[PDB]
Amino acid sequence: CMDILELSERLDLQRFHSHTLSLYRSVCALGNNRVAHALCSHVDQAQLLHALEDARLPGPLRAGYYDLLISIHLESACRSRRSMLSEYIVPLTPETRAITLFPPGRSAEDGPRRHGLPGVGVTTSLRPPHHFSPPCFVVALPAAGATEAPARLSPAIPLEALRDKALRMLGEAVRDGGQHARDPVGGSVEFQFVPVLKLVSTLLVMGVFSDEDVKQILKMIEPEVFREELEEGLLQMKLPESVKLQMCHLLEYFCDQELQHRVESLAAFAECYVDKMQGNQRGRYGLLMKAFTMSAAETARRTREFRSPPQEQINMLLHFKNGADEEECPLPEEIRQELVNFHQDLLAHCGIQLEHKPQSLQELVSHTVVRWAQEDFVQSPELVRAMFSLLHRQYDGLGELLRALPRAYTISVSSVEDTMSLLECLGQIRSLLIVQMGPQEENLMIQSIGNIMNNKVFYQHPNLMRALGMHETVMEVMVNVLGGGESKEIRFPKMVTSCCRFLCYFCRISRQNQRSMFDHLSYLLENSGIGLGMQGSTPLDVAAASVIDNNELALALQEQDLEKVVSYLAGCGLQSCPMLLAKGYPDIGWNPCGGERYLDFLRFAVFVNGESVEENANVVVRLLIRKPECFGPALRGEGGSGLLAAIEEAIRISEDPARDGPGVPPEENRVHLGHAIMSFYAALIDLLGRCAPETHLIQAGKGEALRIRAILRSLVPLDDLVGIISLPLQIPTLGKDGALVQPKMSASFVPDHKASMVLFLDRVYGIENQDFLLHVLDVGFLPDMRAAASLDTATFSTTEMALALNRYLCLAVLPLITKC
Amino acid sequence: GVQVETISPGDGRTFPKRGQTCVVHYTGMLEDGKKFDSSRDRNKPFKFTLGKQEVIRGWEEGVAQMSVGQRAKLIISSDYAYGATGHPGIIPPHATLVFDVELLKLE
Amino acid sequence: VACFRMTPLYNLPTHRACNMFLESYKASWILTEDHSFEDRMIDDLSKAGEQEEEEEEVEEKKPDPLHQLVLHFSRTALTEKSKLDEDYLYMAYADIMAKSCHLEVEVSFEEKEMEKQRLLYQQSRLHNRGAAEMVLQMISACKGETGAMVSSTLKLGISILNGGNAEVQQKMLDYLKDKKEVGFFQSIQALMQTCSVLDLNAFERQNKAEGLGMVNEDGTVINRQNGEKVMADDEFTQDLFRFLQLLCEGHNNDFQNYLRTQTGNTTTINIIICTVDYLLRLQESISDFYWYYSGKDVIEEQGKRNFSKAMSVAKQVFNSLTEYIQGPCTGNQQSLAHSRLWDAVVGFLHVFAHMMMKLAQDSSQIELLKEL
Amino acid sequence: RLVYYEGGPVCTHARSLWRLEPLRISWSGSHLRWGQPLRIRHVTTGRYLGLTEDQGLVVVDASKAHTKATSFCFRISKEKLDVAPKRDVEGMGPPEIKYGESLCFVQHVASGLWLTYAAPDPKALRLGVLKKKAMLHQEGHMDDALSLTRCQQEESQAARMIYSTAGLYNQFIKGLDSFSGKPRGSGPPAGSALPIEGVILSLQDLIGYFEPPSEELQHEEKQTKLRSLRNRQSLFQEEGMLSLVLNCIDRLNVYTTAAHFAEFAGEEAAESWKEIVNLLYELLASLIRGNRTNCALFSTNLDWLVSKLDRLEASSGILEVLYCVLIESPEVLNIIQENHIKSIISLLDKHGRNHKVLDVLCSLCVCNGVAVRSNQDLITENLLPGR
């Protein structure tokens, strides 16, 4: 062994060891807390702190060890906190109530001219705490199975001592820079300053510094501007460009703190003001009710306000900025004046309301940035971007608050615990955005989604969820997993299914959630090209949920999305399923399963709330006829056998093995080709029937409606529908010494297939002739009704076929007979 | 396994009992002398409760054998240590461990 | 029923009331507040410092802060990339630069002259620091994709070209002829092709959506309050054609010829013919709208608004063509003569002939008739 | 050998580039005129568009490209105006045909047939391909006219370089295969002579050609140079020069050392074996460096690269190739395996403390701000605990 300080002259060893530190950082990078714990055994806390304080260390090794400390102990917590820091969930507590824009004083009417010290004082925005684990290597290893144990926490290091050492080191660096010695720590001013500033910025963002520490940091940055009640601050020290970049990071943190303070002050004021407004409105309503109809017109005039929704009531009560009379805005003047005064205070704080010394953070940042740009032609593009972002914020503080407010949200004290749990789960999900999906990551994602869906705040505050962007994060993770190596197959089907189920529930929760997910329909349809590998929820299911039973969104649907889905359906009708071919299924020449999925989406697109959407239905019908392969080989013009012949051939396929399955049941007894073909044709007939025009349009005699009905009748003959409706169904029977012989629903002709035929017959052809009604009753309906009645015994009443027959009758047949 | 060799004597009277919290200062080395863990580096004594299976079997038995105020060397075979699985990234598979353990106090 | 039911604001949870108040206050008090900082910021950034301190012997002096900002954005635009990432900083600073050029009883001749000189000075502040080249580079880098970035770039270009700025025209033409890059005109052509026209299907969908009456309260959810589906990008279309017009304003013969034929480039795009093609598309859309409304006795308010938007876009396109050919540019005249302009003119004549009669027969459409 | 109408990204590739060659030698660079006979040469393959009785419209070798088979002309219209005579002149002549604007019908002079597209291929939708076979027909179609588009000097130079380099390297591969399995013993190498000098010079020229731009350069011109380099890398890869380099490397790798090579090729040939293999690896690195499309090709044959890390003749070059691939392609990172990681660590063990191996491991750990936990864990498990 040698002294590590010999690496100042042993340059090859120095380079190799610095790259070794880089490799340590890489192996623990981006949230690998297990590897960080492992590295704690190779570079212990004593070594890290000694290297931090060592002044003889070569610059590369000094920077490497500072970065290694940050990577092992602080990087994950800093990243999670930084992700959380852009949102303002303000609980309505006494601490929030006490928050004011300007500190109590008398310097000026619009609050004292002097701001409070940035980053100092009470802040109530919700931020989940930091979680660390001791680095011990004598504990018993988790006996639990692999990937089932909880995610590892980052190794712990004493944060109080670390922050004290960081502050002392920054002070010493400032003093040395003032002294202008010829042997800077690390061999250069950059190597002396940049690591210390990186550590200080990391600790600041994690928020471990106390108020006194923040005051010391502010004094080091600028002794005079941040004087409370070295003679030269860091900002005037003639530093390199990288040091200036670290300074820009510090200033960015403090500007973010000022913006957060503004948001919290606005929320605190809003609580009191809405309280006052609600009390005043209650009093006004009481007085109006006590009034004994002085005038009916006046009473209706006044009561319209209470008839209006609360948001409109708020808008009306606040619409007095430019002045209004008591008739327009009932709000009293003594209450209007409070809002006017607060608006003046907010403008003054943002600087929008109006020496060679700055005297404020905004002025200091503006002056510093402009002075740097005037003094030098800055060469670092990152530095230039940082300076000009800071300058823009300083000049447009009000626009900054305007853009930040969409991410602000107030909650009651009772929801704080659940919101914190939800925030922790969302932090885990967000952390999963920067790592390739694996088994452990999939388990963590599924657990986080489950916890979020169990959280009650998820249901009560859909606006909060949308502001947090939970749906976008989940969708991004799902799409990453899907896109990664999509060619071979879909990996982590459980993860994809969990994400899709979560997104469907998100759509169902609220109508604004549905619109927000609808905005991403093209993205979902783009990524839904590959499916059926999950066997559960899919991005196509998410897309359907984003439009289901919403007339506004259905009308907002795009012809381009419709053509994309129709092209997917055409591809399915032309090509076989590679997954089935790999599993060993016979090659039938097309893909009924995917075809059925796309047909289901189209059905939800065209049918809304029990009525056909003409705009979507006409487009879909035109696309389908323009690509005839979407109808399947049976409805093919040149050599199509026909719908009835196709269904009969599918029944034969189902009866015959080696034509229905691989014939060399992990999931729903694999897939059966005969049932798949029947299901595809049933879905197509159902979609066409739902595309059929409405009776009122037909009576009005719209040419478009009549033409569409004629096209549908051309596509599907009536005799084929009657034949399919007449096809016999397998009925449970008792045999083999009382054994129950039951048909396999997932591999046979079922009443759900006849339900689609009945729907098409009712909507397109209709029943208007008594002879036809009697004929269809005699051939198709009565036998099925008799079978359902006969299955009403104690043995067969609850069988799958019996229940399916009951559903078929009650949803398709009996309503039709009632109508006729 | 576990073999205990005294380095400095304890009081010789008080020994850890089941359910008692032992506070220790330890340094861990592989059988070939490579150090992999040490509580003295973190400057914080390590506390564990006997009978809760919080530590490896070799530790559980050796510290029980030790006495308050005693310094000892524990040689722990693989089976009493992390064994075949090891501690990925720290301890190789089938590794004998050597620990220098001082039992500071019992609580 | 719903009207009979009371929904008072005072019978609301405090946190819900707070969120509603924050939304309303943002909408009505903060957003409406007007703060003009663009001129002050641009003046501060343009001012240099201590020129007397370094007295750089070389005439080439270091860029001042505004120059450095423009250079940074030019570097971003020139970086080799597949697509131009949306950049809020660039969009904000482009908006600030565009607003710095204001273009502000009969006004006196001295007042008008002073306004012109002030606008010229404000535009020189920018185009003496590479703003014209930055605008061209950003348009080229957009690679024909519509969005906020290209919208901001076009608005900045219009701001620095307003009034037919000959110096800016010369700088842009010199830069284009020096770089000899086909990306700029490829992007322009792609944007023009993506520009939209009147859509009767979208109009019918919007009508049905508006007619539909939701059940819940207006405050709770949207209440059919959605952006226009018919000619939603009309502002961008007008900006694009205004930029193209401003390139040729003042009978700039060199730019008029360049817009038709880029001699030095490997491939050329005829922007005159591209403009004619868009005009033909718009004319066909307007004819479809007229045929839709021909049977109806009166044109409703939404139809009137859509007609007005289409007519404004058509007016801008016609002005751009006039700017292309005036001076005259004989090459552009011949190109237009051989183009499909005549069919568009025939369709427009038919639409004018019938719409004039229809709108004259009624008095509530006087403004629409005047616009036509 | 067949000609197609294709509309994908092939419009920027080298296989769609043609050269117009008037039948005269003097003033062959003059303005092209309507009805002037000419040949149409495919630049990258060196074959001429022509008509063969057995197969119809094809591209034939220069040996078979006689005037009757390979003479075409451009016509303004399909009318029967060929009766009009045409006489050559000494000079550039009158400008007649314009790039882009002019619409030209291609007519085979000897037969009078028109260049058109064959009838739509059956089951075209099931194919999923828009490629249309071209043919020579008596009538043709109304949209047979073609538009002549200029190509950049860089593109044309790259196409010609591809033609020459493909010829040279195919000759080299054939030479190696000539004596692949025949030991000379004591005597002549027992094969065809190898173009050693030509291969060496060509490799050096191509390395200089693909040399990346210098860092001291200004941003704008550096970006232009980077764009040009990416385009040329893509052109060569699309024409398949990367596969040719890989084949040459395989044939040379079959031999373990220069003496083993000399046992089959002779001492004189073996004097350049190490130089040629090193140059080949350098060229491969230059071809793929900074190009995600080229680097992603190794996601299918990563073992081909990793298994060669321990070869002592070109260790630095092979490591550089691996470094480029791992820096650029996340797909390779996803398909990395424990045996690959162990091979790289074995490189560390057997070649010494080289920081480039550590850089390779870092690139394995992280790429484009996304971490690969499997790679991180494998490196940690197989590198650290040994100490």
PDB file of all heavy atoms in Angstrom, chain A residues 313 315 321 343 373 385 388 395 555 616, chain C residues 7 19 24-25 33 44 68 87 93 205 208:
ATOM      1  N   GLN A 313     -71.022  31.097  -9.047  1.00  0.00           N
ATOM      2  CA  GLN A 313     -71.243  32.007  -7.929  1.00  0.00           C
ATOM      3  C   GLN A 313     -69.944  32.683  -7.516  1.00  0.00           C
ATOM      4  O   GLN A 313     -69.915  33.894  -7.266  1.00  0.00           O
ATOM      5  CB  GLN A 313     -71.848  31.254  -6.747  1.00  0.00           C
ATOM      6  CG  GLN A 313     -73.198  30.632  -7.029  1.00  0.00           C
ATOM      7  CD  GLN A 313     -73.716  29.830  -5.859  1.00  0.00           C
ATOM      8  OE1 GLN A 313     -73.758  30.317  -4.730  1.00  0.00           O
ATOM      9  NE2 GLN A 313     -74.112  28.592  -6.119  1.00  0.00           N
ATOM     10  N   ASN A 315     -67.282  33.165  -9.405  1.00  0.00           N
ATOM     11  CA  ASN A 315     -66.881  34.088 -10.462  1.00  0.00           C
ATOM     12  C   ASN A 315     -67.667  35.389 -10.373  1.00  0.00           C
ATOM     13  O   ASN A 315     -67.100  36.482 -10.484  1.00  0.00           O
ATOM     14  CB  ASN A 315     -67.074  33.438 -11.831  1.00  0.00           C
ATOM     15  CG  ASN A 315     -66.277  32.164 -11.986  1.00  0.00           C
ATOM     16  OD1 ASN A 315     -65.347  31.906 -11.224  1.00  0.00           O
ATOM     17  ND2 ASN A 315     -66.629  31.362 -12.980  1.00  0.00           N
ATOM     18  N   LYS A 321     -63.204  43.640 -10.094  1.00  0.00           N
ATOM     19  CA  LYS A 321     -61.872  44.237 -10.123  1.00  0.00           C
ATOM     20  C   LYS A 321     -61.914  45.654 -10.676  1.00  0.00           C
ATOM     21  O   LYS A 321     -61.283  46.562 -10.123  1.00  0.00           O
ATOM     22  CB  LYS A 321     -60.928  43.367 -10.951  1.00  0.00           C
ATOM     23  CG  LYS A 321     -59.481  43.826 -10.919  1.00  0.00           C
ATOM     24  CD  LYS A 321     -58.627  43.031 -11.884  1.00  0.00           C
ATOM     25  CE  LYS A 321     -57.151  43.211 -11.592  1.00  0.00           C
ATOM     26  NZ  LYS A 321     -56.336  43.213 -12.834  1.00  0.00           N
ATOM     27  N   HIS A 343     -54.399  42.011  -3.388  1.00  0.00           N
ATOM     28  CA  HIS A 343     -53.897  42.076  -4.754  1.00  0.00           C
ATOM     29  C   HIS A 343     -52.752  43.072  -4.860  1.00  0.00           C
ATOM     30  O   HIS A 343     -51.746  42.810  -5.531  1.00  0.00           O
ATOM     31  CB  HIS A 343     -55.028  42.454  -5.707  1.00  0.00           C
ATOM     32  CG  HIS A 343     -54.720  42.190  -7.146  1.00  0.00           C
ATOM     33  ND1 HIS A 343     -54.431  40.932  -7.627  1.00  0.00           N
ATOM     34  CD2 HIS A 343     -54.659  43.023  -8.211  1.00  0.00           C
ATOM     35  CE1 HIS A 343     -54.204  41.001  -8.926  1.00  0.00           C
ATOM     36  NE2 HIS A 343     -54.337  42.259  -9.305  1.00  0.00           N
ATOM     37  N   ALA A 373     -23.035  38.492 -17.977  1.00  0.00           N
ATOM     38  CA  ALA A 373     -23.118  38.533 -19.432  1.00  0.00           C
ATOM     39  C   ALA A 373     -22.381  39.738 -20.004  1.00  0.00           C
ATOM     40  O   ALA A 373     -21.836  39.659 -21.109  1.00  0.00           O
ATOM     41  CB  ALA A 373     -24.578  38.542 -19.875  1.00  0.00           C
ATOM     42  N   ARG A 385     -28.006  29.093 -20.465  1.00  0.00           N
ATOM     43  CA  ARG A 385     -29.411  28.761 -20.272  1.00  0.00           C
ATOM     44  C   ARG A 385     -29.841  29.011 -18.834  1.00  0.00           C
ATOM     45  O   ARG A 385     -30.929  29.543 -18.589  1.00  0.00           O
ATOM     46  CB  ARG A 385     -29.663  27.307 -20.666  1.00  0.00           C
ATOM     47  CG  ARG A 385     -30.923  26.712 -20.058  1.00  0.00           C
ATOM     48  CD  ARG A 385     -31.456  25.540 -20.859  1.00  0.00           C
ATOM     49  NE  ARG A 385     -31.681  25.880 -22.260  1.00  0.00           N
ATOM     50  CZ  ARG A 385     -32.872  26.027 -22.827  1.00  0.00           C
ATOM     51  NH1 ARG A 385     -33.993  25.873 -22.142  1.00  0.00           N
ATOM     52  NH2 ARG A 385     -32.939  26.341 -24.117  1.00  0.00           N
ATOM     53  N   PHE A 388     -30.190  32.834 -18.174  1.00  0.00           N
ATOM     54  CA  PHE A 388     -31.321  33.488 -18.815  1.00  0.00           C
ATOM     55  C   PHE A 388     -32.657  32.972 -18.296  1.00  0.00           C
ATOM     56  O   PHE A 388     -33.625  33.737 -18.248  1.00  0.00           O
ATOM     57  CB  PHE A 388     -31.207  33.352 -20.329  1.00  0.00           C
ATOM     58  CG  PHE A 388     -30.246  34.331 -20.931  1.00  0.00           C
ATOM     59  CD1 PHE A 388     -29.061  33.907 -21.498  1.00  0.00           C
ATOM     60  CD2 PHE A 388     -30.513  35.687 -20.898  1.00  0.00           C
ATOM     61  CE1 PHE A 388     -28.175  34.812 -22.036  1.00  0.00           C
ATOM     62  CE2 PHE A 388     -29.630  36.594 -21.434  1.00  0.00           C
ATOM     63  CZ  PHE A 388     -28.459  36.156 -22.002  1.00  0.00           C
ATOM     64  N   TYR A 395     -37.803  38.851 -14.187  1.00  0.00           N
ATOM     65  CA  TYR A 395     -38.573  39.877 -14.880  1.00  0.00           C
ATOM     66  C   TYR A 395     -40.060  39.560 -14.952  1.00  0.00           C
ATOM     67  O   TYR A 395     -40.866  40.488 -15.072  1.00  0.00           O
ATOM     68  CB  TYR A 395     -38.030  40.085 -16.291  1.00  0.00           C
ATOM     69  CG  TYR A 395     -36.918  41.099 -16.363  1.00  0.00           C
ATOM     70  CD1 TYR A 395     -35.624  40.762 -16.006  1.00  0.00           C
ATOM     71  CD2 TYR A 395     -37.162  42.396 -16.784  1.00  0.00           C
ATOM     72  CE1 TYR A 395     -34.606  41.682 -16.070  1.00  0.00           C
ATOM     73  CE2 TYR A 395     -36.149  43.323 -16.852  1.00  0.00           C
ATOM     74  CZ  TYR A 395     -34.873  42.961 -16.493  1.00  0.00           C
ATOM     75  OH  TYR A 395     -33.855  43.881 -16.556  1.00  0.00           O
ATOM     76  N   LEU A 555     -68.218  12.666 -30.320  1.00  0.00           N
ATOM     77  CA  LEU A 555     -68.292  13.628 -31.411  1.00  0.00           C
ATOM     78  C   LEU A 555     -66.935  14.257 -31.689  1.00  0.00           C
ATOM     79  O   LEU A 555     -66.637  14.604 -32.836  1.00  0.00           O
ATOM     80  CB  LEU A 555     -69.323  14.706 -31.089  1.00  0.00           C
ATOM     81  CG  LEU A 555     -70.779  14.259 -31.221  1.00  0.00           C
ATOM     82  CD1 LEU A 555     -71.699  15.224 -30.500  1.00  0.00           C
ATOM     83  CD2 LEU A 555     -71.172  14.131 -32.680  1.00  0.00           C
ATOM     84  N   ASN A 616     -69.961   9.239 -36.497  1.00  0.00           N
ATOM     85  CA  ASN A 616     -68.974   8.173 -36.396  1.00  0.00           C
ATOM     86  C   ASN A 616     -69.386   6.951 -37.207  1.00  0.00           C
ATOM     87  O   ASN A 616     -68.540   6.304 -37.832  1.00  0.00           O
ATOM     88  CB  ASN A 616     -68.772   7.791 -34.932  1.00  0.00           C
ATOM     89  CG  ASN A 616     -67.925   8.793 -34.185  1.00  0.00           C
ATOM     90  OD1 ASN A 616     -67.358   9.707 -34.777  1.00  0.00           O
ATOM     91  ND2 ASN A 616     -67.841   8.632 -32.873  1.00  0.00           N
TER      92      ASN A 616
ATOM     93  N   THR C   7     -77.931  25.054  -4.756  1.00  0.00           N
ATOM     94  CA  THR C   7     -76.525  24.661  -4.672  1.00  0.00           C
ATOM     95  C   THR C   7     -75.727  25.854  -4.165  1.00  0.00           C
ATOM     96  O   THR C   7     -74.909  26.428  -4.892  1.00  0.00           O
ATOM     97  CB  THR C   7     -76.005  24.185  -6.028  1.00  0.00           C
ATOM     98  OG1 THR C   7     -76.557  25.002  -7.067  1.00  0.00           O
ATOM     99  CG2 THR C   7     -76.394  22.737  -6.269  1.00  0.00           C
ATOM    100  N   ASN C  19     -60.136  25.894  -3.514  1.00  0.00           N
ATOM    101  CA  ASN C  19     -59.655  25.564  -4.852  1.00  0.00           C
ATOM    102  C   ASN C  19     -60.444  26.319  -5.915  1.00  0.00           C
ATOM    103  O   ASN C  19     -59.868  26.850  -6.876  1.00  0.00           O
ATOM    104  CB  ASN C  19     -59.741  24.057  -5.080  1.00  0.00           C
ATOM    105  CG  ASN C  19     -58.717  23.293  -4.272  1.00  0.00           C
ATOM    106  OD1 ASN C  19     -57.554  23.681  -4.203  1.00  0.00           O
ATOM    107  ND2 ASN C  19     -59.145  22.204  -3.651  1.00  0.00           N
ATOM    108  N   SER C  24     -60.802  30.871  -9.847  1.00  0.00           N
ATOM    109  CA  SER C  24     -61.489  32.079 -10.295  1.00  0.00           C
ATOM    110  C   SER C  24     -60.589  33.305 -10.193  1.00  0.00           C
ATOM    111  O   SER C  24     -60.580  34.156 -11.090  1.00  0.00           O
ATOM    112  CB  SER C  24     -62.761  32.286  -9.476  1.00  0.00           C
ATOM    113  OG  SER C  24     -63.431  33.467  -9.871  1.00  0.00           O
ATOM    114  N   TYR C  25     -59.846  33.424  -9.092  1.00  0.00           N
ATOM    115  CA  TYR C  25     -58.964  34.566  -8.896  1.00  0.00           C
ATOM    116  C   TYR C  25     -57.848  34.577  -9.928  1.00  0.00           C
ATOM    117  O   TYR C  25     -57.529  35.626 -10.495  1.00  0.00           O
ATOM    118  CB  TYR C  25     -58.401  34.531  -7.476  1.00  0.00           C
ATOM    119  CG  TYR C  25     -57.409  35.619  -7.159  1.00  0.00           C
ATOM    120  CD1 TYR C  25     -57.824  36.923  -6.940  1.00  0.00           C
ATOM    121  CD2 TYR C  25     -56.056  35.339  -7.057  1.00  0.00           C
ATOM    122  CE1 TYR C  25     -56.919  37.917  -6.641  1.00  0.00           C
ATOM    123  CE2 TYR C  25     -55.146  36.326  -6.758  1.00  0.00           C
ATOM    124  CZ  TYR C  25     -55.582  37.611  -6.553  1.00  0.00           C
ATOM    125  OH  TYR C  25     -54.673  38.595  -6.254  1.00  0.00           O
ATOM    126  N   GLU C  33     -54.415  41.083 -15.203  1.00  0.00           N
ATOM    127  CA  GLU C  33     -53.422  42.096 -14.880  1.00  0.00           C
ATOM    128  C   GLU C  33     -52.427  42.239 -16.022  1.00  0.00           C
ATOM    129  O   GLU C  33     -51.926  41.245 -16.554  1.00  0.00           O
ATOM    130  CB  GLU C  33     -52.694  41.729 -13.589  1.00  0.00           C
ATOM    131  CG  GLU C  33     -51.915  42.871 -12.980  1.00  0.00           C
ATOM    132  CD  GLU C  33     -52.814  43.937 -12.396  1.00  0.00           C
ATOM    133  OE1 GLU C  33     -53.754  43.582 -11.656  1.00  0.00           O
ATOM    134  OE2 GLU C  33     -52.581  45.132 -12.674  1.00  0.00           O
ATOM    135  N   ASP C  44     -32.427  46.688 -21.152  1.00  0.00           N
ATOM    136  CA  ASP C  44     -31.403  46.290 -20.194  1.00  0.00           C
ATOM    137  C   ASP C  44     -30.437  45.288 -20.806  1.00  0.00           C
ATOM    138  O   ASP C  44     -29.223  45.380 -20.600  1.00  0.00           O
ATOM    139  CB  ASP C  44     -32.054  45.700 -18.945  1.00  0.00           C
ATOM    140  CG  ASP C  44     -32.935  46.693 -18.225  1.00  0.00           C
ATOM    141  OD1 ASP C  44     -32.707  47.910 -18.374  1.00  0.00           O
ATOM    142  OD2 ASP C  44     -33.856  46.257 -17.506  1.00  0.00           O
ATOM    143  N   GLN C  68     -25.771  37.574 -26.936  1.00  0.00           N
ATOM    144  CA  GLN C  68     -25.441  36.238 -26.457  1.00  0.00           C
ATOM    145  C   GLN C  68     -26.683  35.361 -26.367  1.00  0.00           C
ATOM    146  O   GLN C  68     -26.628  34.170 -26.680  1.00  0.00           O
ATOM    147  CB  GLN C  68     -24.744  36.328 -25.102  1.00  0.00           C
ATOM    148  CG  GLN C  68     -23.329  36.853 -25.195  1.00  0.00           C
ATOM    149  CD  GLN C  68     -22.645  36.930 -23.854  1.00  0.00           C
ATOM    150  OE1 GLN C  68     -22.543  35.938 -23.140  1.00  0.00           O
ATOM    151  NE2 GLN C  68     -22.167  38.113 -23.504  1.00  0.00           N
ATOM    152  N   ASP C  87     -39.404  24.166 -26.327  1.00  0.00           N
ATOM    153  CA  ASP C  87     -38.556  24.858 -25.363  1.00  0.00           C
ATOM    154  C   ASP C  87     -39.301  26.082 -24.847  1.00  0.00           C
ATOM    155  O   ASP C  87     -39.446  27.079 -25.563  1.00  0.00           O
ATOM    156  CB  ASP C  87     -37.221  25.250 -25.992  1.00  0.00           C
ATOM    157  CG  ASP C  87     -36.306  25.955 -25.020  1.00  0.00           C
ATOM    158  OD1 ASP C  87     -36.549  25.863 -23.801  1.00  0.00           O
ATOM    159  OD2 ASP C  87     -35.334  26.589 -25.476  1.00  0.00           O
ATOM    160  N   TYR C  93     -38.808  33.915 -24.641  1.00  0.00           N
ATOM    161  CA  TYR C  93     -37.925  34.989 -25.080  1.00  0.00           C
ATOM    162  C   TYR C  93     -38.269  35.456 -26.487  1.00  0.00           C
ATOM    163  O   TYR C  93     -38.121  36.643 -26.793  1.00  0.00           O
ATOM    164  CB  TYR C  93     -36.469  34.546 -24.993  1.00  0.00           C
ATOM    165  CG  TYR C  93     -35.850  34.871 -23.657  1.00  0.00           C
ATOM    166  CD1 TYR C  93     -35.507  33.868 -22.766  1.00  0.00           C
ATOM    167  CD2 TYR C  93     -35.630  36.185 -23.277  1.00  0.00           C
ATOM    168  CE1 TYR C  93     -34.952  34.164 -21.546  1.00  0.00           C
ATOM    169  CE2 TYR C  93     -35.075  36.488 -22.059  1.00  0.00           C
ATOM    170  CZ  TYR C  93     -34.739  35.475 -21.196  1.00  0.00           C
ATOM    171  OH  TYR C  93     -34.185  35.776 -19.980  1.00  0.00           O
ATOM    172  N   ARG C 205     -70.189  18.163 -36.439  1.00  0.00           N
ATOM    173  CA  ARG C 205     -69.896  17.591 -35.131  1.00  0.00           C
ATOM    174  C   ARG C 205     -69.950  18.657 -34.046  1.00  0.00           C
ATOM    175  O   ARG C 205     -70.497  18.424 -32.962  1.00  0.00           O
ATOM    176  CB  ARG C 205     -68.529  16.912 -35.145  1.00  0.00           C
ATOM    177  CG  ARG C 205     -68.465  15.680 -36.016  1.00  0.00           C
ATOM    178  CD  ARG C 205     -67.037  15.219 -36.205  1.00  0.00           C
ATOM    179  NE  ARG C 205     -66.969  13.907 -36.837  1.00  0.00           N
ATOM    180  CZ  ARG C 205     -66.944  12.755 -36.180  1.00  0.00           C
ATOM    181  NH1 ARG C 205     -66.991  12.708 -34.859  1.00  0.00           N
ATOM    182  NH2 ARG C 205     -66.872  11.619 -36.868  1.00  0.00           N
ATOM    183  N   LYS C 208     -73.613  19.544 -33.314  1.00  0.00           N
ATOM    184  CA  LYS C 208     -74.280  18.537 -32.496  1.00  0.00           C
ATOM    185  C   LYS C 208     -73.790  18.588 -31.055  1.00  0.00           C
ATOM    186  O   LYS C 208     -74.588  18.480 -30.114  1.00  0.00           O
ATOM    187  CB  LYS C 208     -74.065  17.148 -33.092  1.00  0.00           C
ATOM    188  CG  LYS C 208     -75.033  16.106 -32.558  1.00  0.00           C
ATOM    189  CD  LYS C 208     -76.190  15.845 -33.511  1.00  0.00           C
ATOM    190  CE  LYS C 208     -75.723  15.231 -34.816  1.00  0.00           C
ATOM    191  NZ  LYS C 208     -76.790  14.419 -35.459  1.00  0.00           N
TER     192      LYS C 208
END
